[PDB]
Amino acid sequence: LNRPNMVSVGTIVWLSSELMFFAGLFAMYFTARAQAGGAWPPEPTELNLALAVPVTLVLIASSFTCQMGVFAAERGDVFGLRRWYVITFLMGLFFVLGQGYEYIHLVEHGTTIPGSAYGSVFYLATGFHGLHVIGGLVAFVLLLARTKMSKFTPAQATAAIVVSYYWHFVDIVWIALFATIYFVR
């Protein structure tokens, strides 16, 4: 019974709504870039590209690791799932720490939220993505703790799958934000 999965449909439609949320943020960003003529990233601000590439590659590797974990989950063994999801958690934590470090080193000598328009839109666009990543980390921890406390049933597999492609959606919207902010300018 119930040949198409239900949790899958729910997660998919919710991810669509989240995409619309990020649409609102993008619309905020593109305006105030048309108004600032010339060096629209103001003089105290210049982005350090020597740090933003490794964290993006780390996030992509995280996506690969999560897909491997789902492959392991579809056949009923919990330990491969646990290993791949621990790896994914560690890589996401590294990404968040790198982003926070760049925030510190960038607020150190210039750009602030109340000090500019570019700084405002930049921090607003990237901090919400950071919050989404932190939520994904919490979901990973909860899923592992839940696999710890009973035998492996198909419901656990469905939960793993939906958490997986939530993570995929996250690290795709990150690619969009990165290509828009750091390269297009």
Partner: protein, 139 residues
């Protein structure tokens, strides 16, 4: 499912058409060029409907006929055992109370209230997720 996918494809086609038309009509004939705020909303609502429609399309191509999708069928076809539908639970009201605490702590700028609200939200969501998986007590 074949009709849901077709509905979402119709919607995605119309939204993409409208987005492109608006973009190219405001590139010219407008005061300051491309409008940049309706354009974005339109492309990303197109993307929303596209994601949903593509998922439904894959699930339809990977599926055999279903008593719901199938005419010609009788009630003895669906005779079986449905999923698990949760009976009584009291965690939703606690989740809502925690989220409301965090929200009122964000309205009036009070960081301690925001921290307490976030902690309570984590606790209540953990309680909701684990409700039907805790085992018997170990003594």
């Amino acid at each position: 499912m074949h009709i849901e996918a077709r509905l979402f494809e119709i919607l995605t086609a119309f939204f993409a058409l409208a987005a492109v038309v608006y973009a190219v009509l405001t590139a010219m004939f407008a005061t300051g060029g491309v409008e940049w705020a309706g354009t974005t909303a339109l492309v990303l609502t197109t993307g929303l409907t596209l994601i949903t429609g593509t998922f439904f399309r894959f699930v339809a191509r990977r599926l055999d006929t279903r008593p719901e999708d199938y005419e010609d069928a009788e009630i003895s076809d669906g005779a079986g055992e449905l999923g698990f539908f949760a009976p009584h639970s009291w965690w939703p009201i606690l989740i809502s109370l925690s989220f409301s605490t965090a929200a009122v702590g964000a309205a009036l700028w009070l960081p301690w209230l925001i921290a307490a609200g976030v902690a309570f939200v984590i606790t209540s969501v953990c309680g909701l997720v684990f409700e039907y998986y805790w085992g018997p007590e170990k003594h």
